[PDB]
Design an enzyme around this catalytic site. Structure first.
Site, short mmCIF file in Angstrom:
data_model
loop_
_atom_site.label_atom_id
_atom_site.label_comp_id
_atom_site.label_asym_id
_atom_site.label_seq_id
_atom_site.Cartn_x
_atom_site.Cartn_y
_atom_site.Cartn_z
N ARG A 12 -43.52 -53.94 21.58
CA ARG A 12 -42.68 -52.85 21.08
C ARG A 12 -41.46 -53.49 20.38
O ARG A 12 -40.74 -52.85 19.64
CB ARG A 12 -42.25 -51.96 22.26
CG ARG A 12 -41.29 -52.67 23.19
CD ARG A 12 -40.95 -51.89 24.46
NE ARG A 12 -41.72 -52.42 25.58
CZ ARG A 12 -41.26 -53.24 26.52
NH1 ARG A 12 -40.01 -53.61 26.55
NH2 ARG A 12 -42.05 -53.67 27.45
N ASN A 13 -41.23 -54.76 20.65
CA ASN A 13 -40.15 -55.48 20.04
C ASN A 13 -40.62 -56.51 19.00
O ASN A 13 -39.87 -57.42 18.62
CB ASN A 13 -39.29 -56.17 21.12
CG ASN A 13 -38.37 -55.19 21.82
OD1 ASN A 13 -37.83 -54.31 21.18
ND2 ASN A 13 -38.19 -55.35 23.13
N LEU A 22 -34.35 -44.20 13.28
CA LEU A 22 -35.43 -45.09 13.59
C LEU A 22 -35.49 -45.35 15.07
O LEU A 22 -36.42 -46.01 15.54
CB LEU A 22 -35.23 -46.43 12.88
CG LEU A 22 -35.36 -46.51 11.36
CD1 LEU A 22 -34.88 -47.86 10.89
CD2 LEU A 22 -36.77 -46.31 10.90
N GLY A 23 -34.51 -44.86 15.83
CA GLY A 23 -34.46 -45.19 17.24
C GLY A 23 -33.16 -44.77 17.89
O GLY A 23 -32.09 -45.15 17.43
N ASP A 83 -34.82 -56.62 18.56
CA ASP A 83 -34.40 -56.00 19.84
C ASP A 83 -33.60 -54.72 19.51
O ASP A 83 -32.55 -54.81 18.92
CB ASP A 83 -33.58 -57.00 20.70
CG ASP A 83 -33.26 -56.46 22.11
OD1 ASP A 83 -32.62 -57.18 22.93
OD2 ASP A 83 -33.65 -55.32 22.43
N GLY A 130 -30.98 -44.56 21.51
CA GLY A 130 -30.72 -44.86 22.90
C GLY A 130 -29.72 -43.86 23.43
O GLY A 130 -29.45 -42.85 22.79
N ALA A 131 -29.18 -44.14 24.60
CA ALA A 131 -28.14 -43.32 25.19
C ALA A 131 -26.85 -43.42 24.37
O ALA A 131 -26.24 -42.43 23.99
CB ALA A 131 -27.90 -43.75 26.61
N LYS A 188 -27.83 -45.95 18.27
CA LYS A 188 -28.96 -45.61 17.43
C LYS A 188 -29.21 -46.63 16.32
O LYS A 188 -28.35 -47.42 15.97
CB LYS A 188 -28.77 -44.22 16.84
CG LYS A 188 -27.65 -44.11 15.85
CD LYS A 188 -27.21 -42.69 15.72
CE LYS A 188 -26.19 -42.53 14.60
NZ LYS A 188 -25.53 -41.20 14.69
N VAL A 189 -30.42 -46.63 15.78
CA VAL A 189 -30.69 -47.36 14.57
C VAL A 189 -31.08 -46.36 13.53
O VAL A 189 -31.93 -45.53 13.79
CB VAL A 189 -31.88 -48.32 14.71
CG1 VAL A 189 -32.18 -48.95 13.38
CG2 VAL A 189 -31.60 -49.41 15.79
N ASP A 198 -36.38 -59.26 26.67
CA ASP A 198 -37.22 -58.08 26.60
C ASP A 198 -38.26 -58.21 25.49
O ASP A 198 -38.46 -57.33 24.67
CB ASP A 198 -36.40 -56.81 26.48
CG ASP A 198 -37.26 -55.57 26.56
OD1 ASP A 198 -38.41 -55.71 27.05
OD2 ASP A 198 -36.82 -54.49 26.14
O1 LIG Z 1 -33.41 -56.10 16.14
C1 LIG Z 1 -32.25 -56.00 15.94
N1 LIG Z 1 -31.33 -57.00 16.42
C2 LIG Z 1 -31.85 -58.12 17.14
C3 LIG Z 1 -31.14 -58.58 18.32
C4 LIG Z 1 -31.59 -59.80 18.94
C5 LIG Z 1 -32.60 -60.49 18.28
CL1 LIG Z 1 -33.27 -61.95 19.00
C6 LIG Z 1 -33.24 -60.06 16.99
C7 LIG Z 1 -32.75 -58.91 16.39
C8 LIG Z 1 -31.55 -54.88 15.16
C9 LIG Z 1 -30.21 -55.18 14.64
C10 LIG Z 1 -29.57 -54.28 13.77
C11 LIG Z 1 -30.25 -53.07 13.35
C12 LIG Z 1 -31.60 -52.82 13.78
C13 LIG Z 1 -32.21 -53.74 14.69
N2 LIG Z 1 -33.55 -53.40 14.98
C14 LIG Z 1 -34.64 -52.46 14.80
C15 LIG Z 1 -35.13 -52.40 13.35
C16 LIG Z 1 -35.91 -51.39 12.93
C17 LIG Z 1 -36.43 -51.44 11.61
N3 LIG Z 1 -36.39 -52.65 10.87
C18 LIG Z 1 -35.63 -53.73 11.34
C19 LIG Z 1 -35.11 -53.67 12.61
#
Ligand SMILES: O=C(Nc1ccc(Cl)cc1)c1ccccc1NCc1ccncc1
Ligand SMILES: [Cl-]
Length: 288
Positions: A158-159, A30-31, A172, A33-34, A37-38, A154
């Site tokens: 996109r967030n 799903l994503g 995030d 980075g360097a 990953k997610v 941030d």
């Molecule tokens: O957003 C995430 N963490 C985060 C960190 C800080 C804050 Cl304020 C809110 C959430 C995150 C934490 C663990 C795994 C995936 C993540 N995000 C992207 C994701 C993609 C698809 N559905 C849910 C989240």
């Protein structure tokens, strides 16, 4: 005084959050980075419920060092002493077995981010009531975060991720945002310039009042139906001095004088004099 994240090096409750790695089937990405990953996964038994669920899992890439481990561990801690809240991505559990890979499990948001989603209408027709609802939810989510001493740093479309029932959730990607490619981040480090308050840019000062600035750009992002900030402007030393000189964007196309008024408030030179997230929730509540 102490923001939540730097305060989160002083208590993880596995009793409550630890989740067996065997109960996860990891799936499509799903994503990337360097160093992080997610991925999408299916979890059996998350939250003590012997049911089956789709979750999102953030975890380190090979190449990652103890720094990124500490970063992800700080993210987890933060997500644990937060809540959670309808409009923030909710923590579901974690894998932290010593020796095992660190993994942060949160709720899955099926419809991707809000920028892309609005652009996909820029399957049902989008309405002004919808745009205001999303603005209000994000403000509600940020009032929550603020009140937890937590500065996002941030915040941008996109967030913001879109879940079911038209619910939007602040996330995030963090270590899992690709930032080498995304032209949203410019080498200064690479930074989300277009979304940053002047005091963050110049003095490297961040605070809830700087998240408010970014929330302002976020509103522009929403009421342009997923447009990019400062369109037709390039990002150099000059872009700043202007910004620090009262220079602002013009109202987006689907906004209202009343809603534009709100962005400008968020973009006040003096951070002390931008609105708190509490008043943003009320103003928009009033428009709902
Ligand atoms: O957003 C995430 N963490 C985060 C960190 C800080 C804050 Cl304020 C809110 C959430 C995150 C934490 C663990 C795994 C995936 C993540 N995000 C992207 C994701 C993609 C698809 N559905 C849910 C989240
Ligand atoms: Cl659990």
């Amino acid at each position: 005084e102490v923001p939540l994240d730097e305060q989160c090096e002083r208590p993880y409750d596995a009793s409550k959050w630890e989740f067996a790695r065997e109960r996860l089937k990891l799936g499509k990405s799903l994503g990337r980075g360097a160093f992080g990953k997610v991925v999408q996964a299916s979890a059996f038994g998350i939250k003590k419920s012997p049911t089956c669920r789709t979750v999102a899992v953030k975890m380190l890439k090979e190449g990652a060092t103890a720094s990124e481990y500490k970063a992800l561990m700080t993210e987890l801690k933060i997500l644990t002493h937060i809540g959670h809240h309808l409009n923030v991505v909710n923590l579901l559990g974690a894998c932290t077995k010593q020796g095992g890979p660190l993994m942060v499990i949160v709720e899955y948001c099926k419809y991707g981010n809000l920028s892309n989603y609005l652009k996909s209408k820029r399957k049902e027709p989008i309405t002004m009531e919808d745009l205001i609802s999303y603005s209000f939810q994000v403000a509600r989510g940020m009032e929550f975060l603020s009140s937890r001493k937590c500065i996002h740093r941030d915040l941008a479309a996109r967030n913001i991720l879109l879940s079911e029932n038209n619910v939007v959730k602040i996330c995030d990607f963090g270590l899992a945002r690709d930032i080498y490619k995304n032209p949203d981040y410019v080498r200064k480090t690479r930074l989300p310039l277009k979304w940053m308050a002047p005091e963050s840019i110049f003095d490297k000062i961040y605070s809830t009042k700087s998240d408010v600035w970014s929330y302002g750009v976020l509103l522009w992002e929403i009421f342009s139906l997923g447009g990019s900030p400062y369109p037709g402007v390039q990002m150099d030393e000059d872009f700043c001095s202007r910004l620090r000189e009262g220079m602002r964007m013009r109202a987006p196309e689907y906004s209202t004088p009343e809603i534009y008024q709100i962005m400008l408030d968020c973009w006040h030179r003096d951070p002390k004099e931008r609105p708190r997230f509490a008043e943003l929730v009320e103003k928009l509540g009033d428009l709902l």
